[PDB]
Amino acid sequence: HHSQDPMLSKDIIKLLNEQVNKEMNSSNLYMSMSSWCYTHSLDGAGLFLFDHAAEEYEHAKKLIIFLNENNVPVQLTSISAPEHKFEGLTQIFQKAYELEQHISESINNIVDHAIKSKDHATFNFLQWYVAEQHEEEVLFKDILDKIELIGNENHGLYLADQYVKGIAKSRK
Amino acid sequence: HHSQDPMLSKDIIKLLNEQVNKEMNSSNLYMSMSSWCYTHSLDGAGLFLFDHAAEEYEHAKKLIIFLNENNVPVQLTSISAPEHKFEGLTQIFQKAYELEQHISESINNIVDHAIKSKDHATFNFLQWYVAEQHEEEVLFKDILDKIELIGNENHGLYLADQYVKGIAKSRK
Amino acid sequence: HHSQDPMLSKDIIKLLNEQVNKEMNSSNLYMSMSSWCYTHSLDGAGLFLFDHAAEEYEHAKKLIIFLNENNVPVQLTSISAPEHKFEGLTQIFQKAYELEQHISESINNIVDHAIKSKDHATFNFLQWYVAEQHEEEVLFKDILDKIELIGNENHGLYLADQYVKGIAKSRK
Amino acid sequence: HHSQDPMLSKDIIKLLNEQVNKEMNSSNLYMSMSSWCYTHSLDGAGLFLFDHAAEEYEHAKKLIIFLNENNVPVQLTSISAPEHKFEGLTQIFQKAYELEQHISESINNIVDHAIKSKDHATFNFLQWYVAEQHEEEVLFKDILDKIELIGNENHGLYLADQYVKGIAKSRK
Amino acid sequence: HHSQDPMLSKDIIKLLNEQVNKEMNSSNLYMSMSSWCYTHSLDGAGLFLFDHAAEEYEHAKKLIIFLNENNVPVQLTSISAPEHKFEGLTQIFQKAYELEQHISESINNIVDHAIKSKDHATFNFLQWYVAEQHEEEVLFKDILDKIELIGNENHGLYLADQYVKGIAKSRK
Amino acid sequence: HHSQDPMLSKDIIKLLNEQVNKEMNSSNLYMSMSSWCYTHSLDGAGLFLFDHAAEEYEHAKKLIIFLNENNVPVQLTSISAPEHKFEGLTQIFQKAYELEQHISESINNIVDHAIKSKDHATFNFLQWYVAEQHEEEVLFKDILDKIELIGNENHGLYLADQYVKGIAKSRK
């Protein structure tokens, strides 16, 4: 039996497949960061990072669904082993913010390419992912600002972790 | 600051971390199988395997949560790129059933090691996973039985797919 | 008394008027394909196609609305008689799939042209149309995939027409 | 496979098909009339005529449904480009009123022919259409009467348009 | 303490801050136009323009919120004293329509610069403003059309004002 | 057509017009203060100051409405560019408190003048603005006291910002 060919172009397909893989690699990094937090008495950040990892996995799932609906093969490659050694809460969120910047940029690249290809079906699809990612990027900026404002004198780590715990619970 | 040590023993920790990575590998193989289905007109199987893949990741997450609560560092390894090429619906489900059999034995091995090293907190936490995994294994057996009963003469494939679609929709 | 000039530019105006006429054309072609179906015992496909025709005409209306609100005169041209002879269920849905592909492209062209001329009012207006059209194009791909999976052995036509009836009942 | 032959007679079939084409032609004429009004600061009449154009299209769909149900092929022919230049509001509604009288007459002719041929299934079907068309004819007569009562010295045009706008909102 | 850098580029920041100040200038011109209306017995126009001025300030606030969330300093300049003298209702609405045209182009220019520098978070945030501004521009076109249709012979002004009053009350 | 003259005296008119302008200049200063906060990791104060700016703009709007109702021309002059450089959270609220004192005094001056002119309509109108302003002045005193009580050792800025954030949210 004959199945219709992929409804997207080759280049867009490769970009989307790679984006799936990035979100999965993010999801695992955030779980590793979360574990670091949980095993260094920072369960606030641990919870926050664990839930954020599931958001990133949710993005991968949504990209997959869009691939499936366009009859495009999802070609999953490996998910890299995440970094597991960290210096502290601040460094974790500094790395997290940098990652979220990289992810926003990776989406921009696909969106841009959609515009050049005049693939507006894909452009239109992504816009929801653009908006969501922007809010995530802003969130990590805010958390990082806050961790840095509090500092790590005496009870500062505890205060930071309680602040993040509040965000985790708010965003449920 | 001092954070308490891991509350489980070295050997249990190794088995549990192995199982997390194993569930993640399975999850991605199911995603790949799902995509094959979606790109060969079998959207019922497609959906079924997509939802099943998501549920295997949920198992990995549940193990991670248990690890975190016990102050055990999660050790996420690289997740293997799944097989992308399959011969047809029957062979996907034979390979899936065989995988679920292996996952059931993996879990049995951890539970056995818990009994033997007298870790009943772990024994007890795992029971819920034993029961859920057993239902998943039976389900794959039943799907395979049905695929084999229908055959692929004439519109056997369509019928098999619609049947699988019904299962997927009833489980949501 | 003086009425404000058209709020869109000449090129955009022409492309939008041409799209109005094309949607009217496509509506009539789907009506004709629907009638073929109904007069050859395929009332599932006849309903589906009738309701789709109605929806093409709704797209026409929405374009007209946008033209009116911008003080742009609507220039309806002749609608040519649609094709009325067809070879069968598969060939109708093959043709309709190709028409949907062509419509998706005709819209991508308008959108590109909006971007190009910085008419973002019109870009923003079209995005709902891009989204809807994508879902229609996807739907015809899925219906054509299912018809080809089922085939026209024995009661294949019946099964395929009943599947399409299911779709039609579901979309209402 | 054998599909049952048309349930209606040749003559009725031709008259119903030519009525479908007339209603589609009317719909487009009404759209063109609406556009003239919207582009000459007469949005009351613009709305009114657009909505009336949609209703004429619904009449065409209902005739098509009847044909499909009787296993009669629908034969859509060319729909001619409507007139797009008009002299003013009064002329538009004079021309519309004349068209509605012609529409009423063409329906009367089909009903007469059903009686002659003792097609009472058709006669019975047409009754709802006779009733609705008479309501539409009266409506156009009433709007024309009001347009002629108001005049176009001096803010006559505005008052007429506001009155028509009131009707459009009331009927929807 | 270190606070993260502005998340947007220099050129976008300049365009956005320019737009904030531009919306504030417009807002005050609308307030001034409103007052002229209120002091020349045109309280319908008065209300309409007051509410519209308040809504332009809301646009400035929405831009500011976006700037704040991106860690971009808001640069508020002096806001120009508006024109206080006008010739009449028609000339107020001609000048208002011309302003809305300019505001629509200003926004188009920012959106275009976002596409070009691949800032889609900004592109995406702005779309909502494009759509709202388009509706505002159409509204001013429609009001001007109506003012021009009614004229100012006899109680044309009263009628125009009452019409505008109706619009203002329906939009609250 | 003849419009009634202003129902207020010249001196009161000039005072009220100036008060409109002061509240607008306040609104923009508070937004500048708010931006400073938001770009120095103080989003609590940023939110609080942003919302307070909208309260000040609301006062300007209410003064405007009273002018309009008395047939008094609103003669808007420029809104000065606000200060944008600040040393810290304490200095911001020290400047804010001083401003609120100046604003309370400016209202007293108009109220006083109303008493001397025996303009009791205006005296009565303002009393609501007197009460509101007094509560605002007390608020800034309280916030300033609190910021000064907390200090800016280690985590003091964070604690102050969280305290203010609590007020912002309370007052919504």
Ligand SMILES: [Fe+3]
């Ligand atoms: Fe399983």
Ligand SMILES: [Fe+3]
């Ligand atoms: Fe009148």
Ligand SMILES: [Fe+3]
């Ligand atoms: Fe505007």
